[PDB]
Amino acid sequence: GAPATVTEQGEDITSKKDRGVLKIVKRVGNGEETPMIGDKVYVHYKGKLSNGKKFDSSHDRNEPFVFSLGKGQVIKAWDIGVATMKKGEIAHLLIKPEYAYGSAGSLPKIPSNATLFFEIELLDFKGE
Ligand SMILES: COc1cc2cc(c1OC)OCC[C@@H](C)n1cc(nn1)C[C@H](C)COC(=O)[C@@H]1CCCCN1C(=O)[C@H]2C1CCCCC1
């Protein structure tokens, strides 16, 4: 399914080219601006352990997930991946633990050495 597809076909958007963050554009956005560091960003997402079944989803709380880009309020993979997204874009990310919660994990939700999969819809972003 979608995680395997990202493993097979996604682009590596890491600087190191260690395949730590793999991306597929699922629905193209408009604009020519991507967000830059400091911006306030609005998304809807669905996220899950890659080997898991149930999502954490913003829709389940019926409100968008807001954060500031590059300010370390979210995992390194979101800081990296959302910086590549256009407004209206839907992207799939697959993320190795080094760009998420690492060998320490983040229990109870995230175990040690967890790979993570998200679908992200970029709704909007505004400059600091
Ligand atoms: C490790 O803790 C969590 C991880 C994740 C979600 C968590 C969470 O408990 C704080 O709560 C979901 C409740 C919403 C409103 N939320 C998200 C955050 N703050 N509040 C942002 C989080 C503090 C950090 O989350 C992230 O950096 C990423 C990207 C943004 C969306 C949430 N993220 C997660 O890692 C989720 C997990 C995704 C895989 C399945 C388990 C949840």
What is the full DSSP assignment across 79-118? HHHHTTPPBT-EEEEEE-GGGTTTTT-BTTTB-TT--EEE
Protein residues whose CB sits closer than 6 Å to any atom of ligand 1:
45, 47-49, 56, 65, 74-75, 78, 106, 109-110, 116
Among residues 73, 86, 98, 89, the alpha carbon closest in space to that of 21 is found at: 98
Distance from Cα 11 to the centre of ligand 1, integer Å: 24
What dihedral do alpha carbons 127, 124, 58, 29 form, nearest 10°?
Answer: -140
Per the CB < 8 A criterion, the answer to whether 10 and 94 are in contact is: yes
Q: Measured between alpha carbons, how far is 85 from 115 in angstroms, rounded to an integer?
A: 21
- 54-58, Cβ contacts within 8 angstroms, sequence gap of 24 or more: 56/109
How far from the centroid of its chain's Cα atoms is residue 63's Cα?
17
- Domain extent, residue 104, equals 1-128
Q: Measured between alpha carbons, how far is 98 from 89 in angstroms, rounded to an integer?
A: 25
Quoted resolution (Å): 1.8
Per the CB < 8 A criterion, the answer to whether 90 and 123 are in contact is: no
Q: Measured between alpha carbons, how far is 112 from 41 in angstroms, rounded to an integer?
A: 28
Name the experiment that determined this structure.
Answer: X-ray
Q: Measured between alpha carbons, how far is 51 from 28 in angstroms, rounded to an integer?
A: 27
Among residues 81, 79, 75, 70, the alpha carbon closest in space to that of 24 is found at: 81
**Token digits of residue 44:** 């809807």
Beta-carbon contacts of residue 13 (< 8 Å; ≥ 6 apart): 21, 22, 23, 80, 81, 84
- Of ligand 1's listed atoms, the one at least distance from the Cα of 54 is 40
Per the CB < 8 A criterion, the answer to whether 121 and 29 are in contact is: no
Number of domains in the chain: 1
